[PDB]
């Protein structure tokens, strides 16, 4: 071996990774990246192990090994040899054991904790007992460095035990208690308090463990106070995590926890971030533990002056004023206006009358803040408030006028539509007067912003009566501001006015037609003059306005300018934030232009792919990283375990998603014209299934797939097969890996659609094998969750909020089950009997859904699955009847209408498709089905679909198995049960059989002397319930031929028609003219 020579070369690489020049630093990062993860781990662990080597190289290797075990544990350790794996573990514990340097000691404790985390099996037990053993012995240890190391590992991964309660519980308690009482050490107390919070957060529903650890809470609070008056918000951030995820832990010392938060918040000597985070404890509690906070209204009453005081400190998102109004909003919403409005109401009234403008400004912002959560309680004072607020548009201080504009536009959102209905006269006049007649251009722009809110939430009917005077003023404003844009380049007010015109046009719809020529030429002269980079937001808002004007007037009015606008829209990229506006303008263009938009696809498809391909910026690092990048405002983080957080650049995520949705639109709406761009978008959308940063991106990626196969079908089946081969493996891997239930249901439904498109032969043996295991696991997970919800409903942590959560999980699980059935139906329809051997692996789990002690959605969907086996996989399906045949016959009289429907459907397709082996069962099924049909309230809203399927099944037995039933005796009864209209598919089935019966050479269905013909006409006349589709259904023609044959018997025709109502006779004519 060349191990020492390779390690020596690895040591030179670490040096180059820390070189000043980015030439060698990039050449080392490229080299490091190509080293297999299995070689990396040994190389890095050996570098850390050599303490006689450069300290900087050792620190580099520790950070690199910490990242390695986080980012890809599975790619590196599981594959390593067993002796190599045994050596990794013992070595890591030896490094921590012999380390002198505290900076290194901490980093190796992080590496040990990350490795320990990935060595816990599914059953819940430690696979590295030596790690847990080291932790246990280092707590006792005389070496302070080892006591600190055991604490560090535990803080990082407090789930280090599978016998946490079982025996070690008091060992943990005593350990945290000693390290928090020990005022002869500084870092140990802070670390111990954070470790406590971390252990509690890792035991989310353990009410008994909270009671057992409630003793440590007074001590944790002392550490919150202590660390804070030493500029350390670490333990105060732990407290905010407690209130958020696990507030029940605070209950034994809630008064103390609340008092501390109020004190830190009202303490002038603390920084803005510390005071905001302290307020955050009380605010979070109003959202997560309101019923608990509602017992201490005394503290909530004292929080109000604190938030108001913050709002008064004016002189931006991270300012006390902005933090204060946001907290007031969330708290009013969390606790409701019945409790909050009485507290804040009088404070606001006194602030509005105060001679200091900062109080008037804050009183108006506090009024805007409480509208979301106190508006039901504010309806009686609303008129008085609006009059008070309108007069602040004349306040001596301009900033107070801006806040009055803000309040007007906030009231137009919170109190809509009632606000618009009652106040349009005073409000529209004050807003227009402040826009036109006021000399301060900043108040004008704030007033236009409130007008957009008023019209955006004003219903069309409420807007139309005064549209003329509104449009009249907005035109005058636009015209005068356009003169200023030409000669001085001023755009502040014009930006808001253009959007106000767009909002008015979007509400008015066809009512904006007479006003099209009053704005449109002027709007085109705004985009041409906005070639400058400074006028980019204006040019974007104006493109939004032109497209929103065109969308309201329709394709006929917008047609004369549609080519001018499309050309001028593509001129923006050749003569140069604004991407979002252009992307949305083209969506409007297509929606108006219909299939004639196809000619513009070559010029818009370029930038549409470019924005659907934007890459996000990946962020990692430990504790102090999420607070240092709040200035951006477009950078969001998610607090993962180990305090090590993941961040993403929120900047292009919404544009990336919007563009993806446009390609979906184009593939289904411009089908014929999208074919040329199919192979490129298939390659774009396939890796987008694993884009775990944006839910809407994965949904769009999933929705695109069956739409892309319809385009690929016009080319031929060869292109279609190679397009399907790009997405088949990716779609299956996404079903087994998708974390979101809503996104998974979309992936499952698109996979199901693609199979129906492709037909038989679309899946290979590896894809069937992976699918079987994936669907088996989804079914196993369906049943574990039901068991878990049952035990969680008897837990000591059970409550109103837990109850709400469990019902949402149950609903999602039911929805996923509907999608398992969807994927199965398309496999059974395509493959028919060939796929029954493959289906056997799912058979135990599917038959489990139809166990009588399972919830009704389980029995329903288990029967839907067996209905597809009968319909598409017969006569082979009879080999499996020991699994479903007797349960379907017993389930036809079930208490659930949904279950009765699934069972009755199965009994009908058993008659039609099953074969001669089901004949004895067809005989038994008839009386059971008649019993459900004749049962009272069978045709009510809740039971009509189940009943219609019972009538349909009876008909399929009579039609396909006449030898198993007395058709001549059942026939007059079955004729009385018609017509069906709720279930259109089954209305067709019965209408086809009724036609067979009438057309028969022995038509006993007419009765003696054709006495049932009026009834037959009444049934058919219920072609007013849209059951018989004149077009695609050939039975519409057969029903018309039956009816028109009666015309040849004058008296019989006159009598059948005279017994119908005027709306029924006009339905018989409509049918006769169409078929």
């Amino acid at each position: 071996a060349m191990a020492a020579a390779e390690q020596q070369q690895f040591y030179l690489l670490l040096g180059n990774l820390l070189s000043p020049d980015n030439v060698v630093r990039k050449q080392a990062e490229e080299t490091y990246e190509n080293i297999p993860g299995q070689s990396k781990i040994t190389f890095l662990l050996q570098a850390i192990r050599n303490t006689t080597a450069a300290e900087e190289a050792r620190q580099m290797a520790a950070v690199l090994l910490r990242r390695l075990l986080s980012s890809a544990f599975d790619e590196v350790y599981p594959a390593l040899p067993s002796d190599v794996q045994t050596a990794i573990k013992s070595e890591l514990l030896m490094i921590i054991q012999m380390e002198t340097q505290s900076s290194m000691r901490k980093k190796v404790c992080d590496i040990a904790a990350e490795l320990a985390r990935n060595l816990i099996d599914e059953d819940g037990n430690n696979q590295w007992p030596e790690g847990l053993k080291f932790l246990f012995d280092s707590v006792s240890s005389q070496n302070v460095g080892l006591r600190e190391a055991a604490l560090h590992i535990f803080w990082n991964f407090p789930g280090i035990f599978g016998n946490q309660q079982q025996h070690y519980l008091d060992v943990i308690k005593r350990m945290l208690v000693q390290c928090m009482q020990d005022q002869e050490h500084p870092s140990i107390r802070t670390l111990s308090a954070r470790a406590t919070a971390a252990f509690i957060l890792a035991n989310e529903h353990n009410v008994a463990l909270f009671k057992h650890f409630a003793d440590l809470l007074p001590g944790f609070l002392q550490a919150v106070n202590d660390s804070c008056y030493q500029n350390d918000d670490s333990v105060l951030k732990s407290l905010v995590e407690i209130a958020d995820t696990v507030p029940k832990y605070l209950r034994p010392h809630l008064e103390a926890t609340l008092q501390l938060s109020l004190k830190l918040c009202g303490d002038t000597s603390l920084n803005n971030m510390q005071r905001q985070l302290a307020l955050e404890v009380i605010v979070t509690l109003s959202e997560t533990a309101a019923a608990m906070l509602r017992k201490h209204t005394n503290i909530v009453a004292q929080t109000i002056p604190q938030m108001l005081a913050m709002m008064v400190d004016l002189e931006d998102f991270d300012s006390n004023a902005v933090a204060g109004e946001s907290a007031l909003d969330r708290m009013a919403c969390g606790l409701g206006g019945k409790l909050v409005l009485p507290m804040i109401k009088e404070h606001i009234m006194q602030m509005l009358q105060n001679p200091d403008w900062k109080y008037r400004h804050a009183g108006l912002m506090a009024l805007s803040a409480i509208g979301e959560g106190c508006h039901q309680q504010m309806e009686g004072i609303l008129n008085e408030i609006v009059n008070f607020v309108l007069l602040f548009l004349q306040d001596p201080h301009p900033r107070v006028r801006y806040a009055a504009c803000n309040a007007v536009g906030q009231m137009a959102t919170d109190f809509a539509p009632g606000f618009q209905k009652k106040f349009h006269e005073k409000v529209i006049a004050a807003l227009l007067q402040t826009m036109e007649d006021q000399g301060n251009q900043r108040v004008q722009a704030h007033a236009a912003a409130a007008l957009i809110n008023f019209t955006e939430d004003c219903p069309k009917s409420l807007l139309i009566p005064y549209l003329d005077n509104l449009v009249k003023h907005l035109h005058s404003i636009m015209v005068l501001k356009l003169q200023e844009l030409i000669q001085k380049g001023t755009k502040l007010v014009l930006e808001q006015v253009v959007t106000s015109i767009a909002s008015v046009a979007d509400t008015a719809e066809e009512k904006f037609v007479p006003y099209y020529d009053l704005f449109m030429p002027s709007l085109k002269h705004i985009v041409e003059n906005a070639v400058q980079k400074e006028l980019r937001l204006l040019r974007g808002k104006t493109i939004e306005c032109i497209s929103l004007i065109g969308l309201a007037v329709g394709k006929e009015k917008f047609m004369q300018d549609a080519s001018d606008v499309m050309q001028l829209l593509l001129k923006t990229q050749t003569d140069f934030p604004q991407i979002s506006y252009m992307i949305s303008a083209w969506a409007r263009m297509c929606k108006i232009l219909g299939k004639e938009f196809q000619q513009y696809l070559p010029v818009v498809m370029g930038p549409l792919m470019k924005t659907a391909s934007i890459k996000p910026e990946v962020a990692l690092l430990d504790t102090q990283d999420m607070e240092n990048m709040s200035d951006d405002d477009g950078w969001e983080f998610v607090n993962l375990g180990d305090q090590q957080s993941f961040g993403i650049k929120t900047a292009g995520l919404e544009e990336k998603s919007t563009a993806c949705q446009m390609l979906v639109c184009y593939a289904k709406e411009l089908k014929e014209g999208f074919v040329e761009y199919t192979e490129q978008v298939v390659k774009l959308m396939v890796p987008l299934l694993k884009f775990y940063f944006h839910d809407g991106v994965r949904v769009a990626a999933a929705e695109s797939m069956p739409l892309l196969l319809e385009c690929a079908r016009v080319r031929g089946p060869e292109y279609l097969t190679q397009m399907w081969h790009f997405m088949c493996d990716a779609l299956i891997k996404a079903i087994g890996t998708e974390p979101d239930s809503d996104v998974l249901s979309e992936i499952m439904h698109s996979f199901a659609k693609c199979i129906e498109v492709m037909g038989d032969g679309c899946l290979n043996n590896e894809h069937f094998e992976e699918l079987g295991g994936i669907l088996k696991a989804k079914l196993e997970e369906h049943f574990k969750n039901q068991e878990l919800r049952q035990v969680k409903r008897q837990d000591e942590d059970y409550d109103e909020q837990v109850e709400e959560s469990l019902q949402d999980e149950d609903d999602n699980d039911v929805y996923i089950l509907t999608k398992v059935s969807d994927i199965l139906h398309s496999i059974f329809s395509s493959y028919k009997e060939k796929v029954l051997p493959w289906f056997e692996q799912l058979l135990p789990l599917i038959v489990n859904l139809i166990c009588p002690h399972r919830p009704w959605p389980d029995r329903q969907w288990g029967l839907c699955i067996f209905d597809d086996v009968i319909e598409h996989c017969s006569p082979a399906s009879f080999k499996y009847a020991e699994y479903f045949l007797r349960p379907m016959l017993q389930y036809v009289c079930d208490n659930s209408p949904e279950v009765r429907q699934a069972a009755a459907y199965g009994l009908g397709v058993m008659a039609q498709y099953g074969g001669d082996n089901y004949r004895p069962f067809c005989t038994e099924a008839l009386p059971l089905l008649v019993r459900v049909i004749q049962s009272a309230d069978s045709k009510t809203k809740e039971n009509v679909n189940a009943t219609e399927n019972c009538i349909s099944a009876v008909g399929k037995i009579m039609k396909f198995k006449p030898d198993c039933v007395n058709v001549e005796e059942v026939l007059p009864h079955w004729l009385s049960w018609l017509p069906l209209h709720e279930d259109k598919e089954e209305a067709v089935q019965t209408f086809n059989y009724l036609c067979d019966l009438i057309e028969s050479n022995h038509p006993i269905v007419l009765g003696p002397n054709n006495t049932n013909l009026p009834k037959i006409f009444s049934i058919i006349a219920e072609g007013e319930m849209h059951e018989a589709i004149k077009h695609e259904d050939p039975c519409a023609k057969r029903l018309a031929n039956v009816v028109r044959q009666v015309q040849t018997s004058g008296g019989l025709w006159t009598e059948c028609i005279a017994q119908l109502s005027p709306e029924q006779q006009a339905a018989i004519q409509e049918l006769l003219n169409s078929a």
């Binding site: 509907t818 839907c864 209905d867 429907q901 699934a902 459907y905 399927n949």
Partner: peptide, 4 residues
Amino acid sequence: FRVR
């Protein structure tokens, strides 16, 4: 969607 409707369903059976």
